[PDB]
Symmetry: C3
Subunit: 259 residues, 3 copies
């Protein structure tokens, strides 16, 4: 292995082989770090998380194959997160409790995944994505930057289940999926779209449109929505909300000009 | 610390500083009791629960600030519950497995919180409240006494997400929210109201009214409902159901006269 | 006890009394095997699972009564599964992470139960049943062979809650319940029926019928559905899908003739 002298590793932690733990990493009580896990500098790993969780091939003969997991700098992973090998997570990642993340998945930078979320295999999550509590992200889903998935959202992938050909959902830049919504397989939710709470999204959602209901139907442009408190137009949200965003200290327009 | 000689503390338990464990408390295998936790007499804490879980300020410098957690007498907390500091829980509390309860939250007496439920910060839960499996209780929610939240209910708080001003849901005395229902931000669900399974509640619900659907619509008075088995009028439920309630040994009317 | 010399039992495992662990069983780090647990040959038990979890009577006096749990051969149970006593699980069972299974429950052979699922007490699950992530299975539910419950499905049982007389849902052979659907108490979902994603099923569903919506309504025969990719008729699914099924190596028709 390769573990930093500044790493703090609490009681009960179990470490395997070919593990690299960088500087100022703190691994809380009881974590099990399985083989082929690389934890980048400054990260915190919550108690009893299990990192480099076994892929299916392990069970053939109980011999652990090599499926490297890398976690980026400064993660803040909370308790009992389970993360599979063959997955890459970027920097400043943060989680709630008991989150599960499968293999062959890629998660960008400054992403947040709340308590109980279940991210499946072969999932793509871009940067500054915010997934709240108990969100199910099915295999093949593609979540672009700045997307928000609120509690209990479920992204499906088998159009006529059970079947052999899956179609993942693709969620474009800044789209917001409100709580307890379910999206059907292969659906494209376009930029700056808003899917209202509890919707059953059976059709693509056009850019800057609001849909609600079961099945969800277009109700209006996102720009029509007013703040319930202040009466100000809310969307695109990038102009009215910036806590934790990269243009927090400036403004979106100046920010975007720079990138 | 201050731990009772009658307390039973199983193998693997980890105890921090400024912890008080009263008489006849039983802490099962592997719990991690973090600093500033007070567990009242006669309580049972399920294996691997983590009590006094770290608030956000801890991560600034990995130095644990003081945020006291108090749990009342006779709790029956099941496995792997995670409970934050700056929270108060009353007596005879009981939980299912893997429940998460955040900080700055207040939970009354004789409350039950089922498996997987995720109770956020700044939540108020009164007495004799029954929250079932995997219920999401958002920040700012106010749940009055005798309310029932059935499996997979979700109480939201950001009316035009993501935004800066949250509005919590308030659920009044005895109201019942059936399974897989979602309530929108700032909604008032009045006394003895019934929200039918799977509803999307977008408007306040008047006292003793039944609403169902997406969006939920008023269908009738609660008093119209008949028991599917016995044909007897069911509601107000306080008159037809009393298992585990304070008037269990008497009757509601005599009971209420006394308080 | 009775533990096989070929059993592999990792660090931190806690074993009680009257436990039988057969040949080639592998119990991962930190499992707690409570009294009266029988694990059949060749099974794998994921880290930190808790087997023979305490029934309610234990809490009367903290004295553990006898409530035997049996798990069949070749199980592949993943991490942190919690399984109660007075329950029987058949062979080739497999689970995802953090699944909870209560007492007085019977689970057949070649069944799969995904991450977070919460199976209550007095539940019957037949063979080759596939329950996905975070499915709630209420007390009294009866799930026949080959049924599929997709993510976030919830089967209820109190028709006018809270009440004293529960009615479980019965799901017949091969029926498929798509994601985020909720079924009301006492509902009969017949053979080869399809409940579309996110439905609120308030009425029995006839054999080979598709229902969708809130409340769910019949839309067509299952045989009308075409594969979204190939345009081939999909259902009965037993003729178009067989990965992991008993007729995988042959065909359903020849297979059924033999049984
Ligand atoms: C979990 C957390 O921590 S916070 C979760 C984040 N927030 C959420 O999930 C909820 C966010 N809010 C929503 O999703 C809302 O549904 C919105 C913003 C889309 C609703 O848009 P609104 O500003 O309420 O438009 P408005 O309420 O004036 O339009 C209401 C009409 O459409 C209906 N409607 C509004 N929202 C919905 C909905 N989600 N589903 C079905 N119908 C709806 C209303 O009942 C009303 O019908 P009416 O014509 O009979 O009066
Ligand atoms: C998880 C556990 O352990 S138990 C969970 C606790 N129980 C539950 O969550 C379910 C409780 N039951 C409900 O919520 C029910 O929906 C009730 C009690 C509100 C339904 O009231 P009912 O007594 O069924 O009235 P009833 O069924 O006669 O009225 C039915 C009409 O309204 C419709 N309807 C009834 N309930 C709903 C619903 N939840 N959503 C949408 N429509 C509904 C029916 O389909 C029917 O429509 P129709 O006019 O075409 O026939
Ligand atoms: C989580 C995982 O890993 S995968 C989860 C497994 N897969 C799922 O849960 C989703 C499976 N798919 C479904 O359940 C679908 O709803 C199906 C297959 C029942 C839909 O049948 P379809 O083949 O899409 O029929 P189709 O789409 O042509 O009929 C669509 C019409 O009914 C409506 N409709 C279709 N499905 C639904 C639904 N679930 N709820 C409400 N309305 C629906 C459509 O909006 C459309 O309405 P329209 O007349 O205005 O055009
Ligand atoms: C800030 C915060 C986010 N998510 C959590 O799970 N806990 C916290 O304290
Ligand atoms: C009675 C009971 C309630 N809740 C649980 O999680 N387990 C139990 O045994
Ligand atoms: C194949 C598979 C199924 N379910 C899981 O939880 N993990 C896996 O690797």
């Amino acid at each position: 292995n390769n573990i930093s002298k500044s790493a703090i590793i609490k009681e009960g932690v179990i470490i395997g082989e070919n593990v690299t733990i960088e500087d100022n990493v703190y691994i809380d009580y009881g974590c099990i770090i399985r083989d082929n896990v690389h934890i980048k500098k400054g990260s915190f790993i919550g108690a009893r998380s299990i990192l480099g969780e076994y892929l299916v091939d392990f069970y053939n003969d109980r011999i652990n194959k090599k499926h490297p997991l890398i976690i980026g700098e400064n993660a803040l992973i909370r308790t009992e997160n389970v993360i599979y090998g063959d997955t890459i997570i970027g920097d400043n990642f943060q989680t709630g409790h008991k989150v599960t993340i499968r293999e062959n998945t890629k998660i960008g930078n400054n992403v947040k995944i709340g308590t109980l979320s279940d991210i499946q295999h072969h999932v793509y999550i871009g940067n500054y994505v915010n997934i709240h509590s108990n969100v199910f992200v099915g295999e093949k889903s593609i979540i672009k930057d700045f997307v928000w998935l609120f509690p209990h959202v479920v992204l499906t992938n088998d159009p006529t289940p059970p079947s052999n050909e899956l179609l993942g959902v693709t969620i474009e830049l800044f789209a917001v999926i409100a709580a307890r919504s379910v999206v059907l397989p292969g659906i494209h939710i376009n930029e700056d779209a808003l899917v209202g709470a509890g919707a059953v999204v059976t059709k693509d959602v056009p850019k800057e449109t609001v849909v609600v209901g079961n099945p969800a139907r277009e109700i209006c442009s996102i720009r029509k929505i007013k703040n319930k408190i202040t009466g100000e137009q809310v969307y695109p949200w990038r102009y009215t909300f910036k806590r934790g965003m990269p243009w927090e200290e400036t403004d979106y327009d100046t920010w975007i000009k720079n990138i």
